[PDB]
Amino acid sequence: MREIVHIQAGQCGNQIGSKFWEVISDEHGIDPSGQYVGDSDLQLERINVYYNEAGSNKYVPRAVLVDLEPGTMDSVRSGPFGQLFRPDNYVFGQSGAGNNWAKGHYTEGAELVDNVLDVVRKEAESTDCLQGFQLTHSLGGGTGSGMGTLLISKIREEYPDRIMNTFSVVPSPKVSDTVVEPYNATLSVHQLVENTDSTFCIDNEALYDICFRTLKLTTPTYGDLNHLVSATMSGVTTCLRFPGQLNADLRKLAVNMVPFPRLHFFMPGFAPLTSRSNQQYRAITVPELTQQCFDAKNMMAACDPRHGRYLTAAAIFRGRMSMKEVDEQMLNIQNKNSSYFVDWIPNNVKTAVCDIPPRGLKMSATFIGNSTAIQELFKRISEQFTAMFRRKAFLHWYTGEGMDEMEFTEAESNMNDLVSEYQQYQE
């Protein structure tokens, strides 16, 4: 009734999506072979949101895996949940974009977006009532960024009214591993602002900081970061799949969160993140989850919320808890942090409580914050973009694929407007 189409672009997006599908299968009790090995009737009540029915008690995810390089696609196929996805949904090219936005958008992604849409449409028109799409990609890469923006534009043209969600990993200087990634990020933000309903900005540096300080992980890997992102993704769309005392779907969150059409960039989070040592000596209650959701160190974006003012916030709780406690916690947060919330919005937090906690967790809370501090990431990206564009640093690679220099100027100017608009409502 509220089915969702999931698409993963690039290595980062593909790995994040694989971890997300593993997490979801754990939540719904789906055997890695595709069978249902659950123990409750609530898991099958709304399993159609993410999974299709294969008949013989097999549930194939409604996911479209796309990458310009077959290596990551084969790695996904060979993983623990490789047999989950339908083979015809694997859409792999011949060679990767080589961290080139132009390659991944104008030529190499252009002669593959047709095959991508031929299965995106097949998945979409096979649903009772489509709720929207979700994308996982990285803004710094070529394949992820360029092909994701191209596919976003194609889908938005094909499905103007559905909800378009993107879980995009934003590059940062502190963990930079690409020379031309600011170019790709600046080119991607242009399309993200115009053709998305909600873009959940995620940053690798913040995930490293979380895994190092909060979880106290000595040697974090990409598995840990992808698990954090997967937990956030599962929390965001948990009111669709399980009953709750106060339901809130994707469209409800979009309505309650964005004040203006292009202010749909959010900082995610997760409440019960606790170290191994402190697991037994910490009381997991609604207040604790509240101050950990609103803690600056728990945000999965590099920017610090204390440097800006919150426009809107959304904390989706999971588990059995009294609504009075949740409401008083939000009132306390509003009153204590009144300086960090906009005064022209009476109440900022859109709370939602879900009855079913995550597996192994007594209760949880997924935080979604729409703060003007998001402008910091785009300001840094624009600074790097201007620094390289003043000298035409790497533009011959992009011009060789047909994209002209005028596009870079438009992308920077349009992305500069996005920074100003967030600064407009920041005092």
Binding site: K19, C211, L215, L217, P220, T221, Y222, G223, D224, H227, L228, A231, P272, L273, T274, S275, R276, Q279, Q280, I284, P358, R359, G360, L361, K362
Partner: protein, 50 residues
């Protein structure tokens, strides 16, 4: 010889951290003859008196 795959990059430490119910809370006994064992027996342990 042949190329060798690595399993450390595949490790997911967060998965065990989320499940608080999966915590054990059980520690192994120290060796009585080891100096830590003698310390535990003498400075931290005591003999029943009543």
């Amino acid at each position: 010889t042949s190329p060798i795959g690595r399993n450390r990059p595949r490790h997911d430490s967060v998965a065990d951290l989320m499940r608080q119910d999966m915590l054990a809370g059980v520690r192994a006994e120290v060796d009585p003859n080891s100096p830590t064992g003698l310390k535990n027996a003498r400075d931290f342990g005591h003999r029943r008196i009543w």
